[PDB]
Amino acid sequence: SMEQVAMELRLTELTRLLRSVLDQLQDKDPARIFAQPVSLKEVPDYLDHIKHPMDFATMRKRLEAQGYKNLHEFEEDFDLIIDNCMKYNARDTVFYRAAVRLRDQGGVVLRQARREVDSIG
Structure with a gap:
């Protein structure tokens, strides 16, 4: 159908946006x-x-x-990375400290991606 196709093009574009977001989070x-x-x-x-x-x-x-249907699902996985690390590693470790910095610095990237997804639908 023409509807299934248009959905597939939305998913493709969501995928392209989330790829950029991922690259920014990983930097x-x-x-x-x-x-x-x-x-x-x-x-x-x-x-x-x-x-x-x-x-x-x-x-x-x-x-x-x-495999990501919306930004919420993507954020869930990002948050796992951070939250797993902060449980497994103690506060005074290079690992725990790195997660904190990723969390704080990622919040800015995620704050704008939430608006771009609401905006572009």
Whole structure:
């Protein structure tokens, strides 16, 4: 149908916007602490601590599969990255400190993406 197509073009454009957003959020992690999943070979007990792991590569895979339907779903995953890190790592670690900085610096990027998605529909 012509309706299914028009939906597919909206999803494609949402995907293109969320790709730019992702690139901006990941520039706020210059040390690449959150680039890849936590290694289960190097942290064998990780899944006893964190039930829903997340990272930027895993978000990227989902994005390119057009698996995000709206900005809320994308933000959920971003927030997992941050919140997992702040539980698993103690306050006085380079990891916890990096998540805090990502959270604070990402809030500005997310604040404008919420308006661009409402705006462009």
